[PDB]
Scaffold this active site. Sequence first.
Site, PDB file in Angstrom:
ATOM      1  N   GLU A  55      24.146   8.772   5.312  1.00 53.32           N
ATOM      2  CA  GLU A  55      23.058   8.431   4.393  1.00 53.32           C
ATOM      3  C   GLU A  55      23.526   8.066   3.000  1.00 53.32           C
ATOM      4  O   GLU A  55      24.481   8.677   2.497  1.00 53.32           O
ATOM      5  CB  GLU A  55      22.101   9.639   4.248  1.00 53.32           C
ATOM      6  CG  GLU A  55      21.484  10.139   5.563  1.00 53.32           C
ATOM      7  CD  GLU A  55      22.301  11.264   6.214  1.00 53.32           C
ATOM      8  OE1 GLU A  55      23.552  11.298   6.098  1.00 53.32           O
ATOM      9  OE2 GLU A  55      21.702  12.118   6.912  1.00 53.32           O
TER      10      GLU A  55
ATOM     11  N   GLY B 200       3.057   6.304   8.632  1.00 50.50           N
ATOM     12  CA  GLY B 200       4.462   6.630   8.345  1.00 50.50           C
ATOM     13  C   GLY B 200       5.395   5.468   8.793  1.00 50.50           C
ATOM     14  O   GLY B 200       6.588   5.442   8.379  1.00 50.50           O
TER      15      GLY B 200
ATOM     16  N   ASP C 133      -0.168  -7.508   1.714  1.00 45.71           N
ATOM     17  CA  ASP C 133       0.369  -6.126   1.728  1.00 45.71           C
ATOM     18  C   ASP C 133       1.897  -6.181   1.818  1.00 45.71           C
ATOM     19  O   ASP C 133       2.511  -6.044   2.878  1.00 45.71           O
ATOM     20  CB  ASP C 133      -0.140  -5.369   2.934  1.00 45.71           C
ATOM     21  CG  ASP C 133       0.048  -3.860   2.857  1.00 45.71           C
ATOM     22  OD1 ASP C 133       0.553  -3.422   1.819  1.00 45.71           O
ATOM     23  OD2 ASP C 133      -0.331  -3.128   3.820  1.00 45.71           O
TER      24      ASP C 133
ATOM     25  N   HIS D  15       0.803  -1.216   0.000  1.00 49.29           N
ATOM     26  CA  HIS D  15       0.000   0.000   0.000  1.00 49.29           C
ATOM     27  C   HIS D  15       0.839   1.270   0.000  1.00 49.29           C
ATOM     28  O   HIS D  15       0.273   2.339  -0.244  1.00 49.29           O
ATOM     29  CB  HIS D  15      -1.040   0.030   1.125  1.00 49.29           C
ATOM     30  CG  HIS D  15      -0.519   0.410   2.456  1.00 49.29           C
ATOM     31  ND1 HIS D  15      -0.294  -0.551   3.435  1.00 49.29           N
ATOM     32  CD2 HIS D  15      -0.158   1.582   3.029  1.00 49.29           C
ATOM     33  CE1 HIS D  15       0.181   0.000   4.527  1.00 49.29           C
ATOM     34  NE2 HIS D  15       0.243   1.306   4.319  1.00 49.29           N
TER      35      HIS D  15
ATOM     36  N   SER E 186       4.256   2.189   8.314  1.00 40.20           N
ATOM     37  CA  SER E 186       3.911   1.174   7.336  1.00 40.20           C
ATOM     38  C   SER E 186       5.045   0.767   6.397  1.00 40.20           C
ATOM     39  O   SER E 186       5.819   1.649   6.060  1.00 40.20           O
ATOM     40  CB  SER E 186       2.911   1.773   6.293  1.00 40.20           C
ATOM     41  OG  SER E 186       1.645   1.852   7.093  1.00 40.20           O
ATOM     42  N   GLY E 187       5.173  -0.520   6.132  1.00 44.19           N
ATOM     43  CA  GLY E 187       6.204  -1.024   5.225  1.00 44.19           C
ATOM     44  C   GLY E 187       7.462  -1.406   6.028  1.00 44.19           C
ATOM     45  O   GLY E 187       8.328  -2.090   5.461  1.00 44.19           O
TER      46      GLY E 187
ATOM     47  N   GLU F 161      19.962   6.182   7.412  1.00 46.28           N
ATOM     48  CA  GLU F 161      19.318   7.396   7.896  1.00 46.28           C
ATOM     49  C   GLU F 161      19.069   7.315   9.394  1.00 46.28           C
ATOM     50  O   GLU F 161      18.804   6.226   9.872  1.00 46.28           O
ATOM     51  CB  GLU F 161      17.989   7.549   7.152  1.00 46.28           C
ATOM     52  CG  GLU F 161      17.115   8.731   7.429  1.00 46.28           C
ATOM     53  CD  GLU F 161      17.865  10.052   7.200  1.00 46.28           C
ATOM     54  OE1 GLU F 161      18.802  10.356   7.929  1.00 46.28           O
ATOM     55  OE2 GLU F 161      17.504  10.766   6.261  1.00 46.28           O
TER      56      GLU F 161
HETATM   57 CA   LIG Z   1      19.742  12.489   8.063  1.00 43.31          CA
END
Ligand SMILES: [Ca+2]
Lengths: 4, 240
Positions: free
Chosen positions: B69, B186, B93, B45, B188-189, B59
């Site tokens: 990063e 935020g 999903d 999704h 999700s996944g 990150e």
């Molecule tokens: Ca950063």
Amino acid sequence: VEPI
Amino acid sequence: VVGGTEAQRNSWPSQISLQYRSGSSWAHTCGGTLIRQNWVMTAAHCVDRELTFRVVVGEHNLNQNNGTEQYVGVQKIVVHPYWNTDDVAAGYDIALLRLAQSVTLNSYVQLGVLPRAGTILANNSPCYITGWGLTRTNGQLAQTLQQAYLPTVDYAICSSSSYWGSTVKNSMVCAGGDGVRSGCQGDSGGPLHCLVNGQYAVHGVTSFVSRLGCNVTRKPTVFTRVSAYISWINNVIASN
Ligand SMILES: [Ca+2]
């Protein structure tokens, strides 16, 4: 339901 | 992540931030797990929209230069063939993203370990959710990666009427439901990291929460069960  | 604490910057090196281009900047929209140097696992999704995505690995603080990063474009999106955007409760999903370049592995960037196919965890297994999602229902995104302890709730309990009932399927994992800690928009996944035989493995891909809010008593956060899709994930990577 709420996808997050 | 509601009720989380700030994660140490080298604790969960497989965690990725999935971002989409918004005007002249990029906005975080979902988490993901780096599973090969050029493949990320996330929720289907999160990639439904016709947007331009990029992946950020290494990150920690989304709004400041961490010095670790790596930014990489997405070349191909493969969503599970049975995923249906109008029925998240149906499951499937999950999605695989082929990155435009292979990332470099180091202390902040490592592959996530996947469980053996079919593995189910015992009730109350120790797991952690991680992400930059909202820190309160209808709140704002976290700037720094958060983690929260979220023990599993087995299928038998989770599919009972006081919990999620028939909405949860055997292809999903439930974790949390204490009313204080949970995933939120935020996250999700992203991964659910669980400790098995002394090693943390990624058993869940964050999928959904309740319509009542993120942290709701007896409505644990629901994840796709990774161990149900090992054949599919291997079949995809081997042919792409
Ligand atoms: Ca950063």
